[PDB]
Design a protein around this ligand. Structure first.
Ligand SMILES: CCCCCCCCCCCCCCCC(=O)SCCNC(=O)CCNC(=O)[C@@H](O)C(C)(C)COP(=O)(O)OP(=O)(O)OC[C@H]1O[C@@H](n2cnc3c(N)ncnc32)[C@H](O)[C@@H]1OP(=O)(O)O
Ligand SMILES: CCCCCCCCCCCCCCCC(=O)SCCNC(=O)CCNC(=O)[C@@H](O)C(C)(C)COP(=O)(O)OP(=O)(O)OC[C@H]1O[C@@H](n2cnc3c(N)ncnc32)[C@H](O)[C@@H]1OP(=O)(O)O
Lengths: 204, 205
């Protein structure tokens, strides 16, 4: 083991946490300078290089965080549960509320200037989609849909939930109908998708 | 009428396409300084306030450029075309993205940007496109069993299914990516699925 590993780790988390803080009001990752991040972390500018070779590597570390937290809880909830929809929506909604900046980061940096970061978010998205596709096969309530069809179906589900993010930033209009409020809308759309699954032949 | 209007409009567009140019490689609108845009536009910083009182206003003008172009083409295609209207509607989007990449990425990206008025202008634009489709669906009358509220939720799903595929239209696809997971085919498959599901859906509780 490397000496003072806990200390190094807390500084790493501090730098990551500093980046998220700076992006809270909608600043893109690509606009952050090393210096802002290291100062907020409470280390000298040179101390950044003990943890990350560049800002790209820091952004890659922010993406990787979701893989061992959020990703497993969606997978977990499929064992227990109608109401698999509500719980899955709730797990997303909860994760967004408690970690807003990070989800906005994931969504926004899909369109950012870093190729590595665009690719890492895509892979994260795909892993989530793959977990669902596999679970839909296991749960076996659409036994007429083969592997290829489930991949397309699972992509639609994940996107349906995730792409609602723009509607979860600001408070809804006073006059917004209750069936168009973010939580209910996702829910109606996922129930519609599940109904649609029953009648779909799959792919040509 | 105001003197030298065409010339003023020419400078307006220059400022606008200058901002677009600066955002070609993923820069957020919020990180643009007035000075960058003006000098890239080839004018004095003070000459910005002739067109826009602030950068927000420049951003709002960037959003307003989609409303009088793209929106009508999507409505236009629904009068003419059994499985045909899907492919044409998808192709309208895909071509619009090809010819106007930076613009659509701006539309997608600034949904999550630092500006509230710009977030709201994009949501409104998005909603008017959704509303057009919801109305056209009612007009076409091929799902007569679905009430107004059901079509709004359904139409919102359709638009999102297409628009939210944008992240897959930036870089080239992986060599080993299956034909059915290619963005154009995937959207097409997902929309055909949605239309099929529309037949058997009773709508909202
Ligand atoms: C800032 C934001 C910018 C983003 C902008 C967003 C833009 C949004 C894009 C716009 C989206 C486009 C809107 C679509 C509008 C339409 O859908 S147009 C279609 C007419 N509208 C309707 O509502 C009617 C839909 N009707 C039906 O599906 C059927 O009721 C009907 C019989 C009328 C027509 O279907 P049809 O294709 O004739 O189906 P069938 O006769 O059953 O069979 C022939 C074809 O259908 C396929 N099929 C049938 N059933 C299935 C199932 N269960 N699974 C898979 N495939 C099925 C067959 O494969 C067959 O193939 P093909 O004929 O080759 O298509
Ligand atoms: C970085 C990116 C981060 C983003 C992360 C994204 C996360 C993605 C979220 C994950 C999505 C959630 C996972 C989904 C997993 C599931 O789908 S769990 C469901 C089990 N799976 C299945 O495949 C079975 C689905 N089966 C069915 O729908 C039916 O075939 C079946 C009968 C088996 C069960 O459905 P059920 O609800 O019992 O329907 P019915 O028995 O027919 O009737 C009872 C209820 O259904 C409603 N109903 C029926 N028919 C309709 C129609 N046509 N329209 C509207 N409603 C209908 C009735 O109203 C009734 O109500 P209720 O019981 O209250 O639902």
């Amino acid at each position: 083991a490397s000496p003072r590993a806990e200390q190094k780790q807390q500084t790493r988390h501090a730098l990551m946490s500093a980046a998220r803080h700076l992006m809270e009001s909608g600043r893109g990752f690509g606009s952050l300078s090393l210096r802002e991040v290291t100062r907020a972390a409470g280390i000298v500018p040179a101390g950044f290089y003990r943890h990350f070779s560049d800002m790209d590597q820091l952004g890659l570390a922010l993406v990787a965080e979701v893989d061992e937290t959020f990703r497993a809880t969606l997978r977990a909830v499929r064992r227990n549960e109608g109401g698999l929809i509500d719980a899955s929506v709730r797990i997303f909604l909860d994760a967004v509320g408690a970690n807003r900046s990070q989800f906005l980061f994931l969504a926004r940096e899909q369109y950012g200037g870093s190729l590595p970061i665009r690719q890492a978010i895509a892979s994260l998205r795909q892993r989530i989609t793959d977990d669902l596709a596999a679970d839909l096969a296991l749960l076996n309530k659409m036994p007429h849909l083969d592997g290829a069809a489930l991949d397309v179906f699972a992509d639609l589900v994940v996107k349906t939930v995730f792409a609602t993010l723009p509607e979860l930033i600001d408070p809804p209009a006073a006059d917004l109908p209750p069936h168009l409020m973010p939580a209910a809308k996702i829910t109606h759309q996922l129930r519609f998708i599940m109904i649609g699954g029953k009648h779909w032949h799959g792919l040509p």
